[PDB]
Amino acid sequence: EHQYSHKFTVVVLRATKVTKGAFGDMLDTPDPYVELFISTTPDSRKRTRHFNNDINPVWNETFEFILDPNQENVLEITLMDANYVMDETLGTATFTVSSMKVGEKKEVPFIFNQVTEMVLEMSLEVCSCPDLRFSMALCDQEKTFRQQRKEHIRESMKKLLGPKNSEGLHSARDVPVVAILGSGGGFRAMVGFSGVMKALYESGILDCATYVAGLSGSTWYMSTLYSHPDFPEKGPEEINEELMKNVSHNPLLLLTPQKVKRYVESLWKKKSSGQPVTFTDIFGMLIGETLIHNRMNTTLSSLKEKVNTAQCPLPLFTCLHVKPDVSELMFADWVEFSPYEIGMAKYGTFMAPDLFGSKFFMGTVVKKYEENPLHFLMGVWGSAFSILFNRVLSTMEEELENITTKHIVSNNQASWIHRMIMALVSDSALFNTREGRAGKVHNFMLGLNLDVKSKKIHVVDSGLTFNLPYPLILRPQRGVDLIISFDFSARPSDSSPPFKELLLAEKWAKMNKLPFPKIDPYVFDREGLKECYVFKPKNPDMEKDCPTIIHFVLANINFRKYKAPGVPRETEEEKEIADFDIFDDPESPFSTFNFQYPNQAFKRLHDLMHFNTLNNIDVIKEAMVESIEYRRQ
């Protein structure tokens, strides 16, 4: 629908003869303040400031309200006397807005106790366009990003493919849209993806990408990379050295009574403003302090600085919106995040990043808070660790398959920390230790013209459904044709087939009628464990030109014998550092739950994915070429 909502303004000018009686006044000269309330609109309770011992107060304060016309909107007015114990209500006055007409700017007089007089000004304009953007199309800033990055791709794609295989581009109308995908998976996903980005960076591959999407763990690296002050001038090369030094010290050791106390103190500001706080806020802060302690106040919006002239691929992040009823998560809605916006592309509903968290009503923001810090989003994107934080202090994948929707929404020496944190939280009343650990936010869908009936909503780690952020780039309007995915999902063993998540994404796609190349149910049987697989579309053309997927998987294969793509390991020492398993080892630093990565562990997983990416450039160069020739039809 449209909206047809009203903006009912109210000015509390002043009052005369504020009294409690001759006796009452002798005991306490009135300290007046007015309070307004409208039961038919989200959090309408508002109050003027009080005036110490004033019987003839002049407030002159303006209050705005967004009203639904199909409602009996009654403005309750209350004259109060601020006290040390319990403010006393001197008089209640009612006022129906209906008795007024749009544009009418009257001025009603109110009398309490037949003595005191108070003057209020009423207004009733027409609420303009919503703050919510209702469209399936990309937003102007994304469209401009594409158009401005287009020629950068073409140029870069030529330098990579060479003049020989880059023929089709010199006359190419539109170059191919390449999307890089990082999977979730804690610090394993984070350190892994960092090696991947170093490779994609130095090899010129990044320069051909239009998007970089991530979820859970990959997201933490993207946040760290894109928020770095020297990025893109400086690249993964230097930034990863920092990542290494930052992750070498156990993050859990950071959680100290003193530091936790700071976290709670800082968060109280957000709480105080009227936003809900949860364990995810705390987790978010911890992740923030370990990864971006020198830039804790970076927001999602501040990333616009690395994409203003399309000098980087557009960063995309995701989480899920879990309705209270929905029992199966494969049915939850995905929420996309980019420096330009946040929203649910299924229902064409978006908003600027700085509004995610604010209070809405009928598509109009009623109360706007300061934009959430990026570490909060980081927390939300990887909230699986906040739900199972006890554990972080039996694989996480195992603990996950059990968890129920109910369990996440509405409902050892390191264990002392968990108690200490919970103790500090209840002691300060930050939030009820029994409520949801998942992440909460005001419902921006609240009371929409035509889930719009529930004050807050649950947002959680997308990894709860599947580990690959496909919904982010399968969005029709993005027209991605080449998807270069990187999977760091945990497997029962290094020999275990790596298509669990992929098949799940494939099922999601079909479920939502979105183009997805057919993943042959015997790819592994016939292929065996490989560093990456390719999944071309299909001969037929039902709704053809569906993307081609290059699926990289976390596996230590050729890296065991080679230091670089065509360079073999020669010294006994070289063979040693590469001699390791990811999931096969019992004492492996690469389990999802682990956060302390000593330098050797970091280098291994980092260099591994670095090598694997580089050891397969040719496969990508090929898929692009094939993508170009497909863009010739």
> Cβ(597)–Cβ(187) under 8 Å?
yes
- Quick one: which segment of 29-37, 296-304, 562-570, 622-630 binds Ca ion (CB under 5 A)? 29-37
- Quick one: which segment of 3-11, 48-56, 218-226, 517-525 binds Ca ion (CB under 5 A)? 48-56
Residues with Cβ within 8 Å of 206's Cβ and at least 6 positions away in sequence, in order, are 180, 197, 200, 212, 312, 313
Question: Nearer Cβ to Ca ion, position 33 or 220?
Answer: 33
596 binds Ca ion (CB under 5 A): no
53 binds Ca ion (CB under 5 A): yes
411 binds Ca ion (CB under 5 A): no
According to DSSP, the residues that pair with 535 across neighbouring strands are: 549
Return the SS3 of 54: coil
Selecting among 216, 223, 386, 462, the annotated active-site residue is 216
Using DSSP bridges, classify how beta strands 482-487 and 178-182 pair: parallel, antiparallel or unpaired: parallel
Cβ count near 434 (within 10 Å): 9
Sign of CA dihedral 170, 172, 174, 177: negative
- Quick one: which segment of 30-38, 168-176, 296-304, 386-394 binds Ca ion (CB under 5 A)? 30-38
Task: Report 357-396 residues binding Ca ion (CB under 5 A).
Answer: none
CA 29 to chain centre: 51
Question: Nearer Cβ to Ca ion, position 31 or 461?
Answer: 31
Please report how close the Cβ of residue 31 comes to Ca ion at its closest, in angstroms. 4
Sign of CA dihedral 345, 473, 523, 176: positive
Question: Nearer Cβ to Ca ion, position 54 or 545?
Answer: 54
Separation CA 498–CA 489 (nearest Å)? 8
- Quick one: which segment of 46-54, 353-361, 438-446, 546-554 binds Ca ion (CB under 5 A)? 46-54
31 binds Ca ion (CB under 5 A): yes
Separation CA 537–CA 502 (nearest Å)? 15
194 in active site: no
Question: Nearer Cβ to Ca ion, position 31 or 487?
Answer: 31
Please report how close the Cβ of residue 10 comes to Ca ion at its closest, in angstroms. 24
Please report how close the Cβ of residue 58 comes to Ca ion at its closest, in angstroms. 17
Separation CA 259–CA 251 (nearest Å)? 12
Question: Nearer Cβ to Ca ion, position 20 or 295?
Answer: 20
461 in active site: yes
56 binds Ca ion (CB under 5 A): no
Please report how close the Cβ of residue 82 comes to Ca ion at its closest, in angstroms. 5
Q: Rounded to the nearest 5°, which phi and psi values hold at 535?
A: -125, 85
- Quick one: which segment of 20-28, 189-197, 431-439, 565-573 binds Ca ion (CB under 5 A)? 20-28
Sign of CA dihedral 135, 141, 144, 148: negative
Binding site for Ca(2+), by residue number, is 28-29, 31, 53, 81-83
Question: Nearer Cβ to Ca ion, position 29 or 250?
Answer: 29
Task: Report 269-328 residues binding Ca ion (CB under 5 A).
Answer: none
The residue within the footprint of Ca ion, chosen from 29, 301, 311, 428 (CB under 5 A), is 29
Please report how close the Cβ of residue 109 comes to Ca ion at its closest, in angstroms. 24
Q: Report how many residues bind Ca ion under the rule CB under 5 A.
A: 6
Binding site, by residue number, is 28-29, 31, 53, 81-83
Residue bearing tokens 């309330």: 37
Question: Nearer Cβ to Ca ion, position 113 or 410?
Answer: 113
The residue within the footprint of Ca ion, chosen from 17, 19, 20, 28 (CB under 5 A), is 28
3-state secondary structure 507-544: HHHHHCCCCCCCCCCCHHHHHCCCCEEEECCCCCCCCC
Cβ count near 9 (within 10 Å): 15
According to DSSP, the residues that pair with 10 across neighbouring strands are: 63, 122
Residues with Cβ within 8 Å of 345's Cβ and at least 6 positions away in sequence, in order, are 136, 334, 336, 471, 475, 477
Separation CA 156–CA 143 (nearest Å)? 20
Selecting among 207, 461, 481, 487, the annotated active-site residue is 461
Please report how close the Cβ of residue 47 comes to Ca ion at its closest, in angstroms. 15
Task: Report 80-139 residues binding Ca ion (CB under 5 A).
Answer: 81, 83
Interface ranges with Ca ion (CB under 5 A): 28-29, 31, 53, 81, 83
User: Catalytic residue positions?
Assistant: 216, 461
